[PDB]
Design a protein around this nucleic acid. Sequence first.
DNA 1: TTTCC
Length: 664
Amino acid sequence: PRRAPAFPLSDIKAQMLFANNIKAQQASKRSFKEGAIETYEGLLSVDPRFLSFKNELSRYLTDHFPANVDEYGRVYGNGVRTNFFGMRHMNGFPMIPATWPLASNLKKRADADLADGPVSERDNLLFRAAVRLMFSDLEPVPLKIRKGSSTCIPYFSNDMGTKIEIAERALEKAEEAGNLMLQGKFDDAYQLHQMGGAYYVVYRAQSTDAITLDPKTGKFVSKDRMVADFEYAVTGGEQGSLFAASKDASRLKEQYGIDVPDGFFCERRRTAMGGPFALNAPIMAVAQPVRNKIYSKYAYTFHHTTRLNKEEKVKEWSLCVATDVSDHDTFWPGWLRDLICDELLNMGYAPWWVKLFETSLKLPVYVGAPAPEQGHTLLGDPSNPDLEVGLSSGQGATDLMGTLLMSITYLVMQLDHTAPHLNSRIKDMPSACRFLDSYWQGHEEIRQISKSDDAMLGWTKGRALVGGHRLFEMLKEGKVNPSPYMKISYEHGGAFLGDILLYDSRREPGSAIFVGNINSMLNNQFSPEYGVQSGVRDRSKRKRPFPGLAWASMKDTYGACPIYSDVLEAIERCWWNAFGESYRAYREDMLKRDTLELSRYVASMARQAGLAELTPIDLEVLADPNKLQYKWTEADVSANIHEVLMHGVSVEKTERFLRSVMPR
DNA sequence: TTTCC
Ligand SMILES: [Mn+2]
């Protein structure tokens, strides 16, 4: 059923993905690599003291604080929704092998019994309306760029200077490129303006994954993670095989002499895509304005910030269903891409720009090194972009594509199983838009709060409410999938955007509260995803610019947690047993050091002015800029701090670009 | 020597 074309790094199609410079060449050839991360300055993730500390803390907490989740995934009691064995990973060493990314998800989707298009005319309107509401009256802003990010194919540059030129250039030739694409000359477009080529696969760590302790054997069990070998990936499942990767960390002893204590495993690795910046720029240019619109006008269902922010909305519900999507990104439907593009043209978006946007969602992928002696292969032909990988992370609007898909999907689940009486309100585009715009503002008897694949569905007192309960029940029994679009189910440990919904005996949205997930504190602090990169002079360019800072926001972030106090003590204690030092003290030092280093990067901070003027968010973001790509937005961060992490292109240059893209 | 609000 069309095996994807594949080329070796030596084939000219691959070669042309990397420019004639060291950086690029090196990325094309980068071989499999692993090794312990510098968890904190001077501390190796596999250091024996640490591993012991981890073994004792994890064992203890699990024992003394077992999960408090009811038959309905609602979490009550201690706020603990699972054991603490997730920290038992030798951070820095991946499971082998990683997965080859699947070239086409058509068969995957079909075998999962999910639709290949809007299933009913209503749905077709709803999705299309989502596009109309989202892409309509956008306000130009400057194109922000993450500092130290790679431009990937073809240059692989990190120099902000270069990135800016690259972007400004793209905005200037995007139009000419898109047209070249409309004429079917992708090679021309790639060669002339670097808009095309392929995504660069970078494997990322999932520092914590499930691990359980079989009471019978007294042995631990790492959650298996299925992976696709090359054959499977190119044949969309037809041939090849799918199997569990090996998380066994015994090899570490034999290979690096690293002592592996019982019950520790290699990390789970997820694929990630590095988009060719020349192409992603013009897209990001439009993407941010969209974020601004939906986060403002549709702030009810789309703009989420504090534990209290969310709590306010949910408290007024009579029923709150916390859903869960399976493998969101690889399931995302190419038809939604096409539908969106088509509707965009109807709204009146420059063809060339829509063509760029489309192409960006069907681009080939260059697999680096999923395992030793593997990779260096390009999937799909750049001359004629026709892949169906689902959502590709490095794409300029991945979050938007996911939200658009899922938000309408949940609204449909509600309509289908609990609110048929609302169907009559959706007769055509206008009536559809009207309905959706009211729905998104939280003004209907059915509601949702969401971001990509996380969401909470609500029902107020009313006609749909009885249906709501029925649906939730369909979900508990979980024998039938409530949607025709994605595989939905309820989240075992109902939580939204990092905060857990803590129900009391009543088990109701009004008497429930939002506490931080205590586990996430543990994961952030003892299982980071990247080391401290002390070798990188520019902390603003590091994955973890100022680690110590997160101590400051800790109380604010997780304090509301029921077992907070206990865990901090459990830690301090186990840390004493393992290092003969006070963990609190350790972090207070890191806090002081980092707070001082920070002022060097904040123009407005006196050369020793405290953390006075900074929000908890500011801190969590500075400690982990990644939270900016999944939890918060430029708007939730103090301006002077956002500047530290991002740098932008002139509003003039972008505003002019946008003006030629948008319809009105 | 490696992505995206
Ligand atoms: Mn959730």
